[PDB]
């Protein structure tokens, strides 16, 4: 089938060690993953009485943060205080500090209720959950379930069969954008394909490479106003970016049909593009290619900034090259050998906003290829504004379009916050712009050369973005699959009682690790690794065969026909092959088998009864 199936709970033994090795079994790391949180709260809300009112209180605050108006906040702040503070306290059940109580009360009495009013309680809640509570969580099924899910995540190898293509929705110069649905879950995505034959022909590897690296820097944080990536992967012939879907077409196309926009309509797009820019600049990325064609619409008319090919990471070294479309570049950018940063986009924006309002770039006066005239008008003509413009808009454009960086908007002060505080936007509430709640002005209508010294340029290209995958799963199959696999296991538990269940063979000894793998003589058996041997069994028996650590000479990873396996060399000149079900499993058996035998042989060598002699 094409559906998600979780590994059996015994996968814990292997995954738990995999995560501990990487320091991923900590409250912070688990609590801040979507699926870790969801599993952590279920444990707290249903299976531990002391932790219920901490999670309840926490989620009540997180709801409080998102409330939009002050009348709403005044009301909910009181409910939270009566319920989770005065009640617990009167019931002698309030494990929070003296200062914590007085922070909220000192504010509530003065009717001052900002979103972050309860932040001190966030910290102390985490403190109360991070210790004993968190360890009891590690003991439980819910952590086992985290492991089952985490196993799937770390095992993703995406292809084409893992997607269902519907329709084409674009041609690039290197490839073509498609519309698809990921079979796993049902989530709708766009698929940007590129061809390595074309890329090689049109010499744009650095352009292809840059986009993958720049998309990973952008695609954390679930930003509404950037087309973001969940995945990337290779095939022998093509690269794929699985990006957010946008059916609505681009603003260059809609500027064509609709014609120049109202001042109030440009403001909507402006607002949105600005939050898209705030995102990349917070993460030290300058786009450098802001324009109408690079802004996509969804089916409701909301917008996202698109192709990231020409974007730049300025965290370490600031760029000086002239890059971008000629009518929307900043004076810094054009200047040969001069460094710049987030400043470049703010001018570009200024140009794109003027574009939408009047049909052309402020510095373009119907000249097509004569780029130079656009560049000298950018550097001399401080552009001229029609009377028709508003004075609110006049100063925003003037601010954005100052030639000197020491003067312009979003540059000398506080980045995007300075643009948002222009009088042009004074009507707006940027929390609403962010939550995409302002109504959009336009709703779209009805729709031969390849070497091996080139393939290695595209290793490390495959990528999965944890935050992205977990979100997809949480918003689709998660709940039903949890209940489904709960149902299986309870009947597997019920099965074994009648068939004489193994009062588990791993318990009460010194077993290091256990789990399924397959061997040859494939043959799928369950393995138990002990400090001095590796046992295994079929189902319904105890282990009636084994391998000792003493006789293992090496543990190599080796390819068994397009498949990676372990190759234990053995003293007799004998070879033993093992295949796992997932990369984590593999990686952890290689590691644990190597450490076990090296350590075992070190011991036996010390013991005169056990070592071998002449």
């Amino acid at each position: 089938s094409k559906k998600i199936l979780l590994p059996e709970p015994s996968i814990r033994s292997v995954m738990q060690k995999y995560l501990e090795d990487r320091g991923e079994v900590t409250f912070e790391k688990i609590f801040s993953q979507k699926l870790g949180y969801l599993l952590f709260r279920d444990f707290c809300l249903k299976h531990l009485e002391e932790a219920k009112p901490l999670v309840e209180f926490y989620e009540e605050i997180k709801k409080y943060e998102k409330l939009e108006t002050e009348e709403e906040r005044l009301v909910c702040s009181r409910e939270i205080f009566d319920t989770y503070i005065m009640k617990e306290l009167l019931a002698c059940s309030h494990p929070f500090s003296k200062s914590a109580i007085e922070h909220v009360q000192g504010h509530l009495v003065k009717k001052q209720v900002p979103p972050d009013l309860f932040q001190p309680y966030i910290e102390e809640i985490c403190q109360n959950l991070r210790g004993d509570v968190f360890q009891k969580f590690i003991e439980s099924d819910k952590f086992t379930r985290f492991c089952q899910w985490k196993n799937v995540e770390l095992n993703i190898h995406l292809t084409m069969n893992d997607f269902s293509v519907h329709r084409i929705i674009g041609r690039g110069g290197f490839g073509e954008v498609y519309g698809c649905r990921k079979a796993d879950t049902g989530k709708m995505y766009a698929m940007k394909c590129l061809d390595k034959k074309r890329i090689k022909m049109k010499q744009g590897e650095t352009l292809a490479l840059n986009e993958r690296i720049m998309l990973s820097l952008v695609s954390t944080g679930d930003c509404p106003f950037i087309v973001c990536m969940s995945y990337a992967f290779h095939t022998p012939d093509k690269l794929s970016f699985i990006l957010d879907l946008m059916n609505g077409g681009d603003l260059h196309y809609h500027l064509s049909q609709h014609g120049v926009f109202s001042e109030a309509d440009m403001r909507f797009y402006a607002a949105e593009i600005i939050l898209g820019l705030e995102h990349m600049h917070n993460r030290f990325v300058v786009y450098r290619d802001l324009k109408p064609a690079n802004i996509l619409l969804d089916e409701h008319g909301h917008v996202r900034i698109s192709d990231l090919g020409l974007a730049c990471d300025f965290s370490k070294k600031k760029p000086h090259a002239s890059v971008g479309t000629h009518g929307y570049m900043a004076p810094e950018v054009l200047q040969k050998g001069v460094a710049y940063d987030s400043s470049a986009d703010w001018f570009s924006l200024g140009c794109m906003l003027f574009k939408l309002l009047r049909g052309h770039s402020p510095f373009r006066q119907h000249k097509t290829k004569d780029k130079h005239e656009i560049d000298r008008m950018t550097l001399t003509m401080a552009v001229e504004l029609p009377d028709s413009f508003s004075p609110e808009l006049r100063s925003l454009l003037e601010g954005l379009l100052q030639r000197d960086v020491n003067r312009r908007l979003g540059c000398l002060g506080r980045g995007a916050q300075e643009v948002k505080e222009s009088p042009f936007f004074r009507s707006l509430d940027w929390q609403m712009v962010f939550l995409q709640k302002y109504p959009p002005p336009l709703i779209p209508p009805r729709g031969i050369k390849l070497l091996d010294s080139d393939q290695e340029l595209y290793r490390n290209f495959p990528l999965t973005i944890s935050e992205r995958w977990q979100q997809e799963v949480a918003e689709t199959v998660f709940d039903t699959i949890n209940a489904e696999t709960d149902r299986l296991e309870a009947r597997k538990k019920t099965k074994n009682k009648q068939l004489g269940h193994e009062e588990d063979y791993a318990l009460g000894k010194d077993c290091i690790m256990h789990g399924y793998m397959s061997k040859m003589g494939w043959q799928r058996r369950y393995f138990y690794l002990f400090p001095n041997r590796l046992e295994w069994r079929g189902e319904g028996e105890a282990p009636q065969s084994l391998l000792t650590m003493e006789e293992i000479q090496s543990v190599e990873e080796t390819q068994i026909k397009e498949r990676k396996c372990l190759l234990l060399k053995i003293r007799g000149g004998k070879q033993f092959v093992l295949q796992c079900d997932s990369d984590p499993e593999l990686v952890q058996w290689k590691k644990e088998l190597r450490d076990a035998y090296r350590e075992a042989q070190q011991l036996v060598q010390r013991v005169p009864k056990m070592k071998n002699k002449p």
């Binding site: 009460g508 000894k509 010194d510 002990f530 400090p531 001095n532 041997r533 046992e535 282990p543 009636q544 065969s545 084994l546 000792t548 011991l603 013991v607 005169p608 009864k609 056990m610 002699k613 002449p614």
Partner: protein, 339 residues
């Protein structure tokens, strides 16, 4: 310095000891026994194969009923067998994989085992709730458990890689007496019939005679050129045997305070792992790393027979109290009973 005004004292006292013994050495056992009839060709055969361990067997021990035995294996289990049938009375999964030894208590109520855990763990074979469970974990030693033997249900003597032996009180869970003296890992021990004395064998190449109640080394026997791996009392309690990595067994006498005999042959080059006597003491059975057990004429020093039926080291063996049968344990993972 001072030290070499008593290191000479030590090496002067070692000569007086030689002298006293050299003055007792008027004849040899070989000379005294030269007249008696040879034992003839002892040709025993394998009458059972005990099949259950998944890896090397490191130690075996008959129970006093000459019927049940315990065996400790690399697979991390003890198995108690009923040799008359081949059935298993118990499979005991141990907490540590690294077991090296095991012992059966005289009463039949307990077994002991230990290894690189450095712990002698005691197992109650008749719980007042009908199960087999660890009833004590004797911790104290600072090296591995090499051998151990019950005196009764409440006392046990252990030998360790830390160079000491000790008598334990099983309920107290502590060393009631410590036996220090050896300069190398102690590999084996045997209790005298009366259980008043006991002898140990160690990698310092010496065996020592100990007093249980007093906690003192009475006598020290040298002669081996390499580790002693196994040791065993002669049935009357006045002599004992040892097996060593030097390819020899030797017989020592307590009252003569010296070595009576060496059992060896130019063709036997590998080392001895284990030893015991037939019921009368006339035969000395010995296990070897060459995969055989040899049967020696204890009194004449001739090789009477060979037990050849293991495909790896013979790690351990034992003759039943009733003299009926010999058990051999092997690295090949089987025990065989011969007779």
């Amino acid at each position: 310095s001072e030290l070499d005004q008593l290191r000479q004292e030590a090496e002067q006292l070692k000569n007086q000891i030689r002298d006293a013994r050299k003055a007792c050495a008027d004849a040899t056992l070989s000379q005294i026994t030269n007249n008696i009839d040879p034992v003839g060709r002892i040709q025993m055969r394998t009458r059972r194969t005990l099949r259950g361990h998944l890896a090397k067997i490191y130690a075996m021990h008959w129970g006093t009923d000459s019927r049940l035995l315990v065996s400790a294996s690399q697979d991390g289990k003890l198995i108690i067998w009923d040799s008359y049938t081949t059935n298993k009375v118990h499979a005991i999964p141990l907490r540590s994989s690294w077991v090296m030894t095991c012992a059966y208590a005289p009463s039949g109520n307990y077994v002991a085992c230990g290894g690189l855990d450095n712990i002698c763990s005691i197992y109650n074979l008749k719980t007042r709730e009908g199960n087999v469970r660890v009833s004590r974990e004797l911790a104290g030693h600072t090296g591995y458990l090499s051998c151990c033997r019950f005196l009764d249900d409440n006392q046990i003597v252990t030998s360790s890689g830390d160079t000491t032996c000790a008598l334990w009180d099983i309920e107290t869970g502590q060393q009631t007496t410590t036996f220090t003296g050896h300069t190398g890992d102690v590999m084996s021990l045997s209790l005298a019939p009366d259980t008043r004395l006991f002898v140990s064998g160690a990698c310092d190449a010496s065996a020592k005679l100990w007093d249980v109640r007093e906690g003192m080394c009475r006598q020290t026997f040298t002669g081996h050129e390499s580790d002693i791996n196994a040791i065993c009392f002669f049935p009357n309690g006045n002599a004992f045997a040892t097996g060593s990595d030097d390819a020899t067994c030797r017989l020592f006498d307590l009252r003569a305070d010296q070595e009576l005999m060496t059992y060896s042959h130019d063709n036997i080059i590998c080392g001895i792992t284990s030893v015991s006597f037939s019921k009368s003491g006339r035969l000395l059975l010995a296990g070897y790393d060459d995969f055989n057990c040899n049967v020696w004429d204890a009194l004449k020093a001739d090789r009477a027979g060979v037990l050849a039926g293991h495909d790896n080291r013979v790690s351990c063996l034992g003759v039943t109290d009733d003299g009926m049968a010999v058990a051999t344990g092997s690295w090949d993972s089987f025990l065989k009973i011969w007779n």
